Amino acid sequence: KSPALDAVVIGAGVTGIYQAFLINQAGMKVLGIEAGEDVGGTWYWNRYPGCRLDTESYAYGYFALKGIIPEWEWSENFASQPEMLRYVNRAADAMDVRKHYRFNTRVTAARYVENDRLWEVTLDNEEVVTCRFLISATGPLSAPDIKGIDSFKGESFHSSRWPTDAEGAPKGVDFTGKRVGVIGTGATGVQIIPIAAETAKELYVFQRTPNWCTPLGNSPMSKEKMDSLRNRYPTILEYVKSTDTAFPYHRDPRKGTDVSESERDAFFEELYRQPGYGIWLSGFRDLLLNKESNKFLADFVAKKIRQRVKDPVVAEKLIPKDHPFGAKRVPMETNYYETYNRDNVHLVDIREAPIQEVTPEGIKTADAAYDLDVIIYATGFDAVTGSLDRIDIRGKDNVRLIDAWAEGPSTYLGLQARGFPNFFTLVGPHNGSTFCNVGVCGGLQAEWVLRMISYMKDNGFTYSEPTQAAENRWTEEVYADFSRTLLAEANAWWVKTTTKPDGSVVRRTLVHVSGGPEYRKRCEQVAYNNYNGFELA
């Protein structure tokens, strides 16, 4: 039996729609599947107030850099979610990609059929479609275990499904007269909190531990700036393809320990005040390698927080004590810290007073009862464990992907796993999503996968799977790269350590941290050498 499709692509975010576009442009048959009503992924799902890029719009805008929608005009240096959604909609118009997709459809299971070298893909546990290759673009992030949520009698908002009007704007964003509680001070919370505080009668921020945040420095984009950027796109593209993260930044050549205190302070002050991520990405070369260097920057950011927040007790609570700066994807913010100088804003330390439950009346901590009218659940993400866990994926000998990866992801090139032929995982933490400009990283990744599938078609190969040796060597190489950074000591659970039935010890990181260009170079050496390390038939 032969599959009906060359490929199924799961997800209609930026990654998935471009993979689908590429496959179709190449003359192959592709079906996209998407749970939502339309395209956008992130930019479709996340509708909460303050939702905005951390990457310069022009640098994230790969579909414009690549000449798919080159006329696109950005209105701001760091585009808001509604603009991002318009960009993805326009890109999808230009790629004519919607016709290849099933919308409002969840892939519930995928099983590899060994006799027939194809995937049976189950849609909403009913229809089954067959394809030669299965490609996940289910998103680099996934996603509250609090007693009593269902009992609250006021309004509940969840940042991941913020209610919208018929025009797609967020409902109930005016909190005039309302006592509001926000739980969470990750990326979403720090975008939500300063906006909610503008109208709430009282705002309580329930925070377990603070993250490092830096100011975004967003501003409108002039027509003149937009035109000069567009004229520079061929250069901008070459640049972002050459940096380690694919953001438009590269590390300072110097070690922080080599620079005087006075020079360090001046350098940091300039970068802190420059819009975007430079404070981190343009920082000293040893910032994520060396504790002293890291501490220089963390101390500087801490000093900036103390400047910006009036009450020294409150300030201290907002400054991380227990983790290096940049050990997580750093939230950027617009007047977040100054929000706490407002008289109607209160920080509730729930490490010291954990939440016992949500009640009909509001929130109960170990120490106090907060009567609220509104609760906003500003829930975090896992940028670490990946988005495939909700799909029943079965490879050879009916093995679960979740079991195969129990001791940590095991892949070759971060793209296929032994046991799961003709299955490609785009854009996930195990291949670099966590610290990438995903607009660019993911687009380049989809192009490599296109080239592999085309090669297979040209040669009449219908089977691909990593060897055990190549998968093992890769996975050890990725771990060793990870193990030389401060991430390893700071995020201990990002590493899975397993002593084998005999005595030897296996270590795998959940998160690939290797430089983009080095990673892509290794992928091309493999592709050039007839996909050496993949068995093909």
Ligand X SMILES: Cc1cc2nc3c(=O)[nH]c(=O)nc-3n(C[C@H](O)[C@H](O)[C@H](O)COP(=O)(O)OP(=O)(O)OC[C@H]3O[C@@H](n4cnc5c(N)ncnc54)[C@H](O)[C@@H]3O)c2cc1C
Q: Is 15 in the site for ligand X (CB under 6 A)?
A: yes
Nearest to 449 by CA among 523, 516, 506, 517: 523
Binding residue for ligand X (CB under 6 A) from 26, 29, 36, 463? 36
Q: How far is the CB of 102 from ligand X (least distance, A)?
A: 8
CB of 431 to ligand X, least distance (A): 11
CA pair distance 434, 512, nearest whole angstrom:
8
- Min. distance of Cβ 326 from ligand X in angstroms? 15
In the list 24, 46, 385, 464, the residue contacting ligand X (rule: CB under 6 A) is 46
- Minimum distance, C-beta of residue 456 to ligand X, in the bound complex (Å): 23
- Rounded to an integer, what is the distance from CA 456 to the centroid of its chain? 30
Binding track over 265-304 against ligand X, x by CB under 6 A: ----------------------------------------
Residues facing 506 on adjacent strands: 498
Residue with tokens 């201990």: 492
Report if residue 51 touches ligand X, rule: CB under 6 A.
yes
In the complex, least distance from residue 334 CB atom to ligand X, rounded to whole angstroms: 14
109 interacts with ligand X by CB under 6 A: no
**Nearer CB in complex with ligand X: 271/391:** 391
Total site size for ligand X, rule CB under 6 A = 36
Looking at the Cβ atoms of 106 and 303, the one nearer to ligand X is 106
CB of residue 317 vs ligand X: minimum separation in angstroms?
24
Minimal distance, residue 25 CB to ligand X, in Å: 18
Choice from 58, 60, 87, 377 touching ligand X (CB under 6 A)? 60
User: Token pair 């920057």 is at which residue?
Assistant: 297
Minimum CB distance to ligand X, residue 383 (Å) = 8
- Helix runs in 309-400, H state only: 312-317, 336-339
- Subset of residues 457 to 516 that bind ligand X, contact rule: CB under 6 A: none
Task: Give the span between the Cα atoms of 11 and 32, in whole angstroms.
Answer: 7
- Tell me the one-letter amino acid at 158: H
- By CB neighbour count within 10 A (0-12 exposed, 13-18 middle, 19+ buried), where does 227 fall? exposed
438 binds ligand X (CB under 6 A): yes
**What's the min distance (Å) between Cβ of 494 and ligand X?**
18
The token pair at 178 is 């309302």
Lookup: tokens for 347: 């920080």
Interface with ligand X, residue 425, by CB under 6 A: no
The residue among 40 and 283 lying less far from ligand X, judged by its C-beta, is 40
User: By CB under 6 A, which span of 222-230, 337-345, 433-441, 501-509 interacts with ligand X?
Assistant: 433-441
What is the bridge-based pairing of β-strands 202-207 and 118-123?
unpaired
What is the greatest pairwise CA distance in the chain?
71
3-state secondary structure 343-365: CCEEEEECCCCCEEEECCCEEEE
| CA gap 70, 90 in Å, rounded | 11
Beta bridge partners of 36: none
Three-class HEC string of 261-294: HHHHHHHHHHHHHCCCCHHHHCCECCCCCCHHHH
- Give the nearest distance from C-beta 11 to ligand X in angstroms: 3
Of 46-54, 415-423, 462-470, 472-480, the window that binds ligand X (rule: CB under 6 A) is 46-54
Contact between 391 and ligand X by CB under 6 A: the answer reads yes
For ligand X, which stretch binds (CB under 6 A), given 340-348, 401-409, 431-439, 466-474? 431-439
Stretch that binds ligand X, among 35-43, 217-225, 293-301, 490-498 (CB under 6 A): 35-43
Q: What residues contact 95, with CB distance under 8 A and at least 6 apart?
A: 17, 18, 21, 63, 68
Residue 12 lies near ligand X (rule: CB under 6 A): yes
Alpha carbons 86 and 530: distance in angstroms, whole number: 40
Of the pair 72, 370, the CB lying nearest ligand X is at: 72
CB of 144 to ligand X, least distance (A): 16
Residue 144 to residue 389: CA distance in whole angstroms: 17
Residues 129-168 that bind ligand X (CB under 6 A): 137-141
- Nearest 5°: the CA angle 369, 373, 375 is 80
| DSSP structure string for 442-484 | HHHHHHHHHHHHHHHHHHT---EEE-HHHHHHHHHHHHHHHHT
171-230 residues in contact with ligand X (CB under 6 A) are: 187
Query: To 10 degrees, the CA torsion angle through 253, 256, 258, 259?
Result: 100
Choose the stretch contacting ligand X; rule: CB under 6 A; options: 12-20, 170-178, 399-407, 483-491: 12-20
- Told to check if 11 binds ligand X by CB under 6 A, we report yes
Contact with ligand X (CB under 6 A): which of 180, 330, 427, 487?
427
Told to check if 53 binds ligand X by CB under 6 A, we report yes
* Shorter beta-carbon distance to ligand X: residue 15 or 293: 15
Q: How far is the CB of 140 from ligand X (least distance, A)?
A: 5
Stretch near ligand X under the rule CB under 6 A, chosen from 13-21, 268-276, 483-491, 523-531: 13-21
Burial class (CB in 10 A: 0-12, 13-18, 19+), 220: exposed
- Cβ-based nearer residue to ligand X, 44 or 340: 44
Q: Are 317 and 340 in contact (CB under 8 A)?
A: no
Q: In this structure, what DSSP letter does residue 531 have?
A: T
Shortest Cβ distance from residue 389 to ligand X (Å)?
Answer: 10
Asked if 474 contacts 46 with a C-beta cutoff of 8 angstroms, the reply is: no
Binding residues vs ligand X (CB under 6 A): 10-16, 33-36, 41-42, 44, 46, 51, 53-55, 60, 106-107, 137-141, 187, 387, 391, 427, 436-439, 442
